Design a binder for this molecule. Structure first.
Ligand SMILES: O=c1ccn([C@@H]2O[C@H](CO)[C@@H](O)[C@H]2OP(=O)(O)O)c(=O)[nH]1
Length: 204
């Protein structure tokens, strides 16, 4: 392992990936739950760069996460087309990011699953009365603070735009320490700026 500074734990709102101009295909298991799903757990550097594809000889061995697959199909689905079981996506994230995490394959996926549950984004938002509905009905501030109170750290929100031209919450970034033990304050955040003061939290 070459070591890194921290992890970006990236989750996304499925609805916002499927209501755009691009193509989204439901998993082989069917339409995903109306809940935040995992995009990936990424080893990163504090200088804005990151290591990737650290072991191009370490393919994903499904046997090691066999019993986690049914959960992953629901909490870490692939929305790309054509419809798939998600293995390609998981293989991709493992090879590109997992091999650089210093974590064993099962530990890597379990960590992602554990942090998705711990972050409890959907419920933290409900607690603040922020629920899915059409239109830019919510202030970005209310969303960030609601997650912050429930996680204890401020998230970074990435927004994209739906066919109607509404700016919507697309992905949520939180930071995890390099030992994958707990959430930490992000040393740095990405530099996007697609989130207006008012955004949409699209229903499924
Ligand atoms: O800190 C970062 C920022 C981006 N990425 C990858 O590039 C795509 C940018 O939209 C992101 O979707 C993401 O795609 P992927 O790695 O999942 O395959 C990184 O690897 N590290």
């Amino acid at each position: 392992a070459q070591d890194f500074d921290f992890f970006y734990f990236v989750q996304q709102w499925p609805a916002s990936y499927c209501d755009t101009r691009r193509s989204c295909c439901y998993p082989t298991t069917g339409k995903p739950d109306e809940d935040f799903s995992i995009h990936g757990l990424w080893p990163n550097y504090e200088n804005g760069k990151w290591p990737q594809n650290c072991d191009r000889e370490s393919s994903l061995d499904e046997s090691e996460i066999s019993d986690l697959i049914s959960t992953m199909e629901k909490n870490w689905p692939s929305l790309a087309c054509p419809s798939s079981d998600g293995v390609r996506f998981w293989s991709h994230e493992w090879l590109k990011h997992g091999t650089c995490s210093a974590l064993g394959e099962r530990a890597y996926f379990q960590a992602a699953l554990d942090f998705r549950k711990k972050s409890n984004l959907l419920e933290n938002l409900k607690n603040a009365e922020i629920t899915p509905r059409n239109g830019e009905h919510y202030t970005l501030e209310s969303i960030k603070k609601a997650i912050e109170e429930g996680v204890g750290h401020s998230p970074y929100i990435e927004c994209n735009v739906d066919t109607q031209g509404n700016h919507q919450i697309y992905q949520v970034y939180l930071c995890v320490d390099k030992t994958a033990t707990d959430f930490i304050d992000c040393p740095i955040f990405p530099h996007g700026r697609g989130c207006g003061s008012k955004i949409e939290f699209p229903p499924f």
